[PDB]
Amino acid sequence: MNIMLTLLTNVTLASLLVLIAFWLPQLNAYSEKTSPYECGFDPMGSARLPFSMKFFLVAITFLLFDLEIALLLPLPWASQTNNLKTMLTMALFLLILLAASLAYEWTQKGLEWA
Amino acid sequence: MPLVYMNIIMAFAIALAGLLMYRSHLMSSLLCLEGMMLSLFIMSTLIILNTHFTLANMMPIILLVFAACEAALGLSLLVMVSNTYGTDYVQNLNLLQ
Amino acid sequence: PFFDVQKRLGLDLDRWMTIQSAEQPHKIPGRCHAFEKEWIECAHGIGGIRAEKECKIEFDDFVECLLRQKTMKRLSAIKRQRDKLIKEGKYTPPPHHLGKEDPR
Amino acid sequence: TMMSGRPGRVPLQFLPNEARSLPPPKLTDPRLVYMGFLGYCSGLIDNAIRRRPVVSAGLHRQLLYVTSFVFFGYYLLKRQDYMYALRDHDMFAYVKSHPEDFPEKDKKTYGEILEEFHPVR
Amino acid sequence: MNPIIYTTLIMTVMSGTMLVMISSHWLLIWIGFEMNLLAMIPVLMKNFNPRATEAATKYFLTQATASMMLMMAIIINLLYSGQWTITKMFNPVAMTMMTMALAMKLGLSPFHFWVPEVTQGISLQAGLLLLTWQKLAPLSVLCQISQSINPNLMLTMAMLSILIGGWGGLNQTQLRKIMAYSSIAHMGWMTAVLPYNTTMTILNLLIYITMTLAMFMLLIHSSATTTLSLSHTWNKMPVITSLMMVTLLSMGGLPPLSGFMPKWMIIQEMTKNESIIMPTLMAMTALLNLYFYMRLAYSSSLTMFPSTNNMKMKWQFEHTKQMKLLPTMIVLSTLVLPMTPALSSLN
Amino acid sequence: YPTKETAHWKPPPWNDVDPPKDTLVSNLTLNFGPQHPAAHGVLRLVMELSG
Amino acid sequence: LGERTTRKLTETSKVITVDGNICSGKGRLAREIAEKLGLRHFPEAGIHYADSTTGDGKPLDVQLSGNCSLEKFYDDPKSNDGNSYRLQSWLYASRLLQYADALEHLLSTGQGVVLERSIYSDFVFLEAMYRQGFIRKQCVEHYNEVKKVTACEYLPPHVVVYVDVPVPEIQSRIQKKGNPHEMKITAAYLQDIENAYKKTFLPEMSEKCEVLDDRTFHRLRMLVQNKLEVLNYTTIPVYLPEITIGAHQSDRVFQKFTELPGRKYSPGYNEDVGDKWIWLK
Amino acid sequence: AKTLLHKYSDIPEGTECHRKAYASTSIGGATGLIVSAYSIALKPPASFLEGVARTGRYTFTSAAIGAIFGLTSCISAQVREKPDDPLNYFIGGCAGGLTLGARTRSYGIGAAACAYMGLTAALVKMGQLEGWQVFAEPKV
Amino acid sequence: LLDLIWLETILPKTTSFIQMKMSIMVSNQKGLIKLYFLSFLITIMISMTLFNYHE
Ligand SMILES: CCCCCCCCCCCCCCCCC[C@@H](O)O[C@H](CO[C@H](O)CCCCCCCCCCCCCCC)COP(=O)(O)OCC[N+](C)(C)C
Questions:
Q1: F11 to each of A52, E17, E53, F8, G244, how far by Cα in Å?
Q2: Domains, chain A, ranges and CATH?
Q3: F2 to chain I, minimum CA–CA distance in Å?
Q4: Is E174 part of the contact surface with chain F (CB cutoff 8 Å)?
Q5: Which of D5, D7, D10 sits opposite C8 (nearest CB)?
Q6: Does B97 map to a domain?
Q7: Which of A41, C43, C60, D10 has the fewest C-beta atoms lying within 10 Å of its C-beta?
């Protein structure tokens, strides 16, 4: 077809760059050279748990807005429906709730981001 | 029914059996559940595309929404369970199955 | 308790989404609108129970309308038959270069 | 489900105009007064749970309870009789609808029929 | 969480069930459960305990997988009949799964294992609400799909719910887990008669809800939990223990009492169908269900476990925040027996 | 009717089951320089950062 | 639940519970504290402290109001009857109620209010009684489970002054003090008190007092009201022989409690004590 | 599957005892696999070889019970030649418990199993004779 | 033995014992998820085939 062809040529292109990236310099890897970087001095421990409520406390809100915009997408086509007064309220409606949701977060101090 | 549908349905059956074989930290289960969700979505949409039953073109996306929505909730609970342990299903306080 | 308040108040807020026909935007036909229409016109005062007897034929044709199940078993039987004749028969020359392109 | 889904009739109305024609239950139908005492005792337990000096206290609210349950009990009785009268009606109409399946069997007398006798021993 | 939000949640639960009881289209039913869930989890998380958290984890995890199987079986139904109206389903391989999904939603055995646990994890408020209001919606759809149910599959879970609702009830001390096995046992009686005659189901449902409202209002009134904790109450406010006795017996269905009305209509209905053996086993096991109500009665009212001294000061202080709805919930759940015929109001 | 294997298990807490709370011990600790451009070539500001 | 109409108070203050730790010096601590604060001073809230608020407002007999009697502690400590403990825990419950009597008032009028000794201070008497052996260890285990179960939810403490007096000097004032039972009290016990008291009580609590959300306060305010709730876990069933009572004595004594004029019924209703009959209509 | 019980159902009478006994053996094996399945599911065996040991146990036991039940029943049918009365199964019923009694190596459980398994089987036959519905259709 | 020890063994003590066994068996105290959850799995696998009705 068309698109699958360009996908294949792109991915094969990139993979080609990878293979010419590795199988080319042809020199000596060895231990400690291959040790992970840690601004000089060795790591105090392998990566573990950078825990934060302040991650999900907002990131989840991302997810629930993204679901909303998923409903916003039909709008350009819906605009040409025969009966806009039946539509228009809803076109506003969701946006209000979107805003409303945000507004609720805005001031329950649930939006501390960072 | 055309073989493709059978194949997606089977992908559902695996997307369930994976949820129920159910092992170690439970985050895998929220994944497997979302996979299940996706299989139901696709299996729906292929149908609404099939018969040109046009109104129902609205459903799959709406389906998706709530389904994604509950999963969006699910992580939050995991947080809490992750909050006291560093998650694993292997640790449950409640008694009597 | 199937409360049917939407019916008593006449809101119809749910009912529209039901059924293959039932008015769709720009009057786009369902793929199986006809068998469905007949089959529902068959279905009223008969109500549910006797309906699975008497209207069975209509629902059947509607089934084949949905799945095209039987026509596929047939068409499969033909295409599988043709392999047996593949050495004994050469099929049709035009498919390859007939008037089908002149046809329009 | 029966009765529900019956042709005609409308969903949520508590009681059809098609009723009305049935006589109302009389004011002192014993079932109804029993609804009375039911409310009464409920009104009493209302005191006993909350300590209270039972009976004499809150005779007010107690009267509220008995009036309450007798009141609802009334209409509930009306719908009761309506419903039973209804099934009786549908039943008879159906027995006229299919005379063949509800045969008017001939009634042989005892003299006409034999029946085995079992002596007690 | 401030009441103004709590009430919106609980009201959207009410809405999230009312929606199931209204809509005819399937998609709105699955939406009904789905909205019900999201609004059900947080209310379990008030006060919040290290325990409560994993309680909610249990509940969500099972309800989510149940809703998933349900939606799958709907889609399969549509694939083989192109409909959305409730009505009959048109493909048994789908129908059995809709039965399964609902079987989880009621908590019927052998899907039942989550219910005794979840109850343990929450306060008696959220507990009562979970054991009553959550039992409406899935039944609200089963009554609508009684027409095509595959009775074998229904009676098997309907029985096994009663045996498991029995044996797992003899074993426990703390009351909440026992209330869980009580309910898990009554659901067997509701879902049993469902293939044969739904009106008997709805009757039994009403009695069950009234009953468990009686109990949970009483446990709230005394803040008892573990059986021993209940034992002390005979000296402080003797009445309410002296009333737990009765409501328990109405759970047991000793015949003058109201709780006998369910069983004794059920036995009628099934008997018209012949099926004579099944109600005999069922009614015999219901006895086994009764027995731990009795033992629990022994801990409480009939006999006085030793009081602790510290109780004495508590004698001066009257209970407060009276729950208005309670006395009527006792009385209706007991004395109403010579008002069975009124059941026909339910048509 | 406890089994002895069950009898070994403790009775449930009368409220919050607080003891497990002692268990959380999450921490992280990490170092800037010397290389790090903000470390001016000669600083080792090790720090026990949270999230 | 009416908070929806007002979204809780924005006002704030502090209650003050002086922690004078002695015999006769205990009284001295109270006198300084009463003059010091505008809020009503804690009166000690001992055996009949509940009776003070009950309705009659008046002390009952020792037999049912507490069934402990302090004089019968000092005269025979290490009584075979576990009174040595039975008093301890009973006092703790009463003092807990003290908190509830006044902290609620803090959340109400918003005025400061002066407590006399408070719950955090009850750690120590038992802390010593266990050392002199007046009470067996299980009595203690019961005391700290009920401590953990009950105290933990009460969150804010403090706004209160610790104090000290010499053991020997208090022994001196004790001699001056009129009551015979107080004079009898042993020294080594009291020294063990002051030692553990200073060693731990101030050592922990001052760290919290040094720091001295509205929605949480409203939730806490609900807890202050309906005091049985604050008492709800104080009657935990653990069945130690000294605390626990057989059913006969309890059924009897409570059968005796109803005999009192103001206790048959909820206070507003009672006919025995001249509450208005008009409500009964 | 129902087709399997349907297989066992066409006895006929009790003729060819082996043909029947094989079917009963099949049913006993099926139930053994189910019980083993939930047992493994709810009692995590630890070390899987022990798990197959467990399932081998239950499967073989129930299969044995079914075998011996079936053949004693048909033999009694082909010997007493009554052959239709319920007691004709009951011996096998009583026999079945003893089989169960053997694997458990206990007189007690074997003794009880004899009586109750016997009565159950007798009720089954009685039911085939009387068309008892157990799961009656809604009919009403 | 006839009436204090067997006649009571034969039906009170029987049932009363069997419920001891069953009740400790069903209410197995544990409650690990993987257990009964996997049980939901196999009970579905059974529920589908045994009632599939079709051949
Ligand atoms: C937070 C705590 C949890 C709370 C949870 C408890 C909630 C309880 C809700 C109980 C539901 C009751 C239904 C009442 C709604 C009123 C609407 C009423 O008018 O419905 C009409 C029908 O009328 C109703 O039937 C009236 C029911 C009245 C309730 C009591 C009836 C008699 C009770 C019998 C038991 C004896 C006790 C009586 C003592 C007073 C229209 O319905 P219809 O379209 O026609 O058919 C619907 C399909 N059905 C029959 C299968 C449901």
A1: 34, 37, 19, 9, 20
A2: 1-108 (1.20.58.1610)
A3: 8
A4: yes
A5: D10
A6: no
A7: D10
